[PDB]
Each structure stands twice: as structure tokens, then as C-alpha cells.
Amino acid sequence: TIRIGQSKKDQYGKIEVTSGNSADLPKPTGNNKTLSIWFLSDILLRGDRLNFNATPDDLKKYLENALDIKLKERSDNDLICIALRSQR
């Protein structure tokens, strides 16, 4: 049992932590037709000047480097390819 966050000494922050049995590792399906990406957490990326950034082409470049592939935007018009929001 630990107190976390702001004003944790007062009426705030008391949490119980419990540990579970070691989970199975993620097992994503490798598909060569498309890559789908879901941000489960806020993604912080450096721009190429190492400022933080909001340019998705940098994430495109990052992924295709990290996976050693090449990526292209989904070209249909009745569908959306990208659905990001900025976070500070």
C-alpha cells in the first residue's frame, strides 16, 4: 500500500498494489498486406531536431525503420487512414 501523486500526504493517493502471475507476452499477427497501429499510451517522438513534434511522417519513418519495412498510406477516400490527436 503506497501513496502516489499530488497531495499524497493528505486525503489523496492511497493505493493498494498487487502482483499477478507472469502474463503471456503479446503475440501480434504479422500481416504483409497492412500495418495497423493503435496508441495504447501517449507517444512521445523527437522531431529530427530532437524537439518534440507532431508530424506523423516521422512516425511513419520511425516504424518502417524499426520494423525494416516500407509503409504507404491507405489510399481509399471513403475510409480514413489516420486518426491522431496531439498531446502535451
Place this chain on the structure above:
RNA sequence: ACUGAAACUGUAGUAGAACCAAUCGGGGUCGUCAAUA
């Protein structure tokens, strides 16, 4: 690539003003009673 810290929802405010538990009443006084055979 590392939980901010510290901070009293307190301070002032009369559940009170108004309203008669009251109005009227001599502690008094006279004729029967009963239904049959």
C-alpha cells in the same frame, strides 16, 4: 530517464415577528305516580 512541495470550504448572520385560550351559563327547584277489571 524517476510521484512536486505546501494550502482548514472557511468567514458574518438569534428560527423569528404578531396573536388574551377565550365567549355564553344564579348550584338551581313541586306535583303526583301506576293500569286495570
